[PDB]
């Protein structure tokens, strides 16, 4: 069937939508080529609608069925509980889209009578009705990028589809424990979200070394969400139902599948009927879990049809990396084309055809890649990095305008060992916080989709736990990585690294003079900025922190707060 059917009504905005990066002195100090930086808006929604709309032809085979059997078998070891209303309410972010029924995120979070009354009635309705399609809102995501004329200039906005706040709370009640436990049990080491960035690196490196002659590739499915069929969404439900579940949970899961997940009507911000969805909803709790499962199932089956030898897979939502034993150059190319063919039959053809890579560093997934630096003692250290353009463009925007969720903090945490994060992002934001007297205030940032409340002053212990002490001592980065950062700076009109070094020394000093946690920031985060180096020893605070939930519970679709 058609992934979507449209009425003609436009995807409409809620409030004013700034297109171009605002001129602000502090954002300008990071990035000056403001004309290159843009936010996607509802104005480009039609362009996206065209791309995401198509017929799905799906043909399953014995390899697929074999794999699905394995998955259902593994899922049967999982025991998931219902969350209570109160528990589900606290997993709601404060910034979450308000209900159409006279309450918002703040009210959910403080268990207000009108919110709980509606949530209970929505729950009752899920148990009583299993067929009536549930209403959803369609919105155009406002995301920031840098323009690329070479690649056809401005990207069209992504479409986010979500049900009302009340339903989203009920989703947590029914499924949060399932989406938290199931993927890991089913996929084991292939489940991407379990890994901290440091662990992810170690996993990729060992997988690479475990082959006599390694070959790797990434597979990018064109419009993964549109490729997910009704039957894929029902297969997911069948898999959820393999777990040991509460009776009410089973009813609610089945209702949410048939009334919400498989499809339903799309309403714009002005209440107009936009059309109907028959594919994955971007803004539901199960999006991340479901996409990972379906991708994994299709990929694992496709590996077999492709005749790939000794396959190690890493799956994060629609992001797939496979590392395997090479059969020869021509043999590998051949098997990769057969892989693509299998995936296509499974309804998930590529955006760009996958290419074999015989060097680990060349594999790009989730827009990241492995690279090499050296630690204090000159030992080789691997770490995850990425092209800094988008992180920098967003960082500038987020300086110019207050955004409820702050991606820059996420990037500092996620890419802490990197040259660009340490020298530019850290220096910049610590100088901005100092300038605005916001150094002690907690911020909301997203990590692997989940929304977190993080104090900037806790950055050092967080980094140590996620990346190790070496993250504060890396030097002698690779020439490729330096060149990529350099090229990014030129393109965006960001000051050069040495300029940042000077600034970082000043920031460091200001931080050290405040004592306490701020001193530790100055000491550990900016040790690179001075020749006369302080001794970096393990931080006590890191030990006295529990960071486990960080690499278990994250769903981009999910509206999750920790
Ligand atoms: C299947 N691919 C992988 O699982 C990952 C590879 C990869 C790279 C090369 C290779 F050969 C194989 C795999 O790199 C990764 C780096 C990240 N990080 C950043 C990051 C990147 C994008 C998003 B997002 O817009 O969805 C995000 F939320 C975070 S992070 C913090 O550093 O670990 C992640 C995190 C969980 C999403 C996954 C992978």
Automatic annotation (TrEMBL):
Domain RdRp catalytic: 214-332
Coiled-coil intervals, chain numbering: none
Source organism superkingdom: Viruses
Subcellular location: Host cell membrane; Host cytoplasm, Host perinuclear region; Host endoplasmic reticulum membrane; Host lipid droplet
Subunit structure: Interacts with NS3 serine protease; this interaction stabilizes the folding of NS3 serine protease. NS3-NS4A interaction is essential for NS3 activation and allows membrane anchorage of the latter. Interacts with non-structural protein 5A (via N-terminus). Part of the replication complex composed of NS2, NS3, NS4A, NS4B, NS5A and the RNA-directed RNA polymerase embedded in an ER-derived membranous web. Part of the viral assembly initiation complex composed of NS2, E1, E2, NS3, NS4A, NS5A and the mature core protein.
Primary role: Induces a specific membrane alteration that serves as a scaffold for the virus replication complex. This membrane alteration gives rise to the so-called ER-derived membranous web that contains the replication complex. NS4B self-interaction contributes to its function in membranous web formation. Promotes host TRIF protein degradation in a CASP8-dependent manner thereby inhibiting host TLR3-mediated interferon signaling. Disrupts the interaction between STING and TBK1 contributing to the inhibition of interferon signaling.
Similarity comment: Belongs to the hepacivirus polyprotein family.
The name this protein goes by in its record: Genome polyprotein
Organism name: hepatitis C virus genotype 1a
């Amino acid at each position: 069937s058609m992934s979507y059917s449209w009425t003609g009504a436009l995807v409409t905005p809620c409030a004013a939508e700034e297109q171009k990066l605002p001129i602000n002195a502090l954002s300008n100090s990071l990035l000056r080529h403001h004309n290159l930086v843009y936010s996607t808006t509802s104005r480009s929604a039609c362009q996206r609608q065209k791309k995401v709309t198509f017929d799905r032809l799906q043909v399953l085979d014995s390899h697929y069925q074999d794999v699905l059997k394995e998955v259902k078998a593994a899922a049967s070891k999982v025991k998931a509980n219902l969350l209570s209303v109160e528990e589900a309410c606290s997993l709601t972010p404060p910034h979450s889209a308000k209900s159409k029924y006279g309450y918002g995120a703040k009210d959910v979070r403080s268990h207000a009578s009108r919110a709980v009354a509606h949530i209970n009635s929505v729950w009752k309705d899920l148990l009583e009705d299993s067929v009536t399609p549930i209403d959803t809102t369609i919105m155009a995501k406002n995301e920031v990028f840098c323009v690329q004329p070479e690649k056809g200039g401005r990207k069209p906005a992504r479409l986010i589809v979500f049900p009302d706040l009340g339903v989203r709370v009920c989703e947590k009640m029914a499924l949060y424990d399932v989406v938290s436990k199931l993927p890991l049990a089913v996929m084991g080491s292939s489940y991407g979200f379990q890994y901290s960035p440091g662990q992810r690196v170690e996993f990729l490196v060992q997988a690479w070394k475990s082959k006599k002659t390694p070959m790797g590739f990434s597979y990018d499915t064109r419009c993964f969400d549109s490729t997910v069929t009704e039957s894929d969404i029902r297969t997911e439900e069948a898999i959820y139902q393999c777990c040991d579940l509460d009776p009410q949970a089973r009813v609610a899961i089945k209702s949410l599948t048939e009334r919400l997940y498989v499809g339903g009507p799309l309403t714009n911000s002005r209440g107009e009927n936009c059309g109907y969805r028959r594919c994955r909803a971007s803004g539901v709790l199960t999006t991340s879990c479901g996409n990972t499962l379906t991708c994994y199932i299709k990929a694992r089956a496709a590996c077999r049809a492709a005749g790939l030898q000794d396959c190690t897979m890493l799956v994060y939502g629609d992001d797939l990396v496979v590392i395997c034993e090479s059969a020869g150059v021509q043999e590998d190319a051949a098997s990769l084309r057969a892989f693509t063919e299998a995936m296509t039959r499974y309804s998930a053809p590529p955006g760009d055809p996958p290419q074999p890579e015989y060097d680990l560093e060349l594999i790009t997934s989730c827009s990241s890649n492995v690279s090499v630096a050296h630690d204090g003692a000159g030992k080789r250290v691997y770490y995850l990095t990425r092209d800094p353009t988008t992180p920098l463009a967003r960082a500038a925007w987020e300086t110019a305008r207050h955004t409820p969720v702050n991606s820059w903090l996420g990037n500092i945490i996620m890419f802490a060992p990197t040259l660009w994060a340490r020298m530019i992002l850290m220096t910049h934001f610590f100088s901005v916080l100092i300038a605005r007297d916001q150094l002690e205030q907690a911020l909301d940032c997203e990590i692997y989709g989940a929304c977190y409340s993080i104090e900037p002053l806790d950055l050092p212990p967080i980094i140590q736990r996620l990346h190790g002490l070496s993250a504060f001592s890396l030097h002698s980065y690779s020439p490729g990585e330096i060149n990529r950062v350099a090229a990014c700076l030129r393109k965006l009109g960001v000051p050069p690294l040495r300029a940042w070094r000077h600034r970082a020394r000043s920031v460091r000093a200001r931080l050290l003079s405040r004592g306490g946690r701020a001193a530790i920031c100055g000491k550990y985060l900016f040790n690179w900025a001075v020749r006369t180096k302080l001794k970096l020893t393990p931080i006590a605070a890191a030990g006295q922190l529990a960071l486990s939930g960080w690499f278990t519970a994250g769903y981009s679709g999910g509206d999750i707060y920790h």
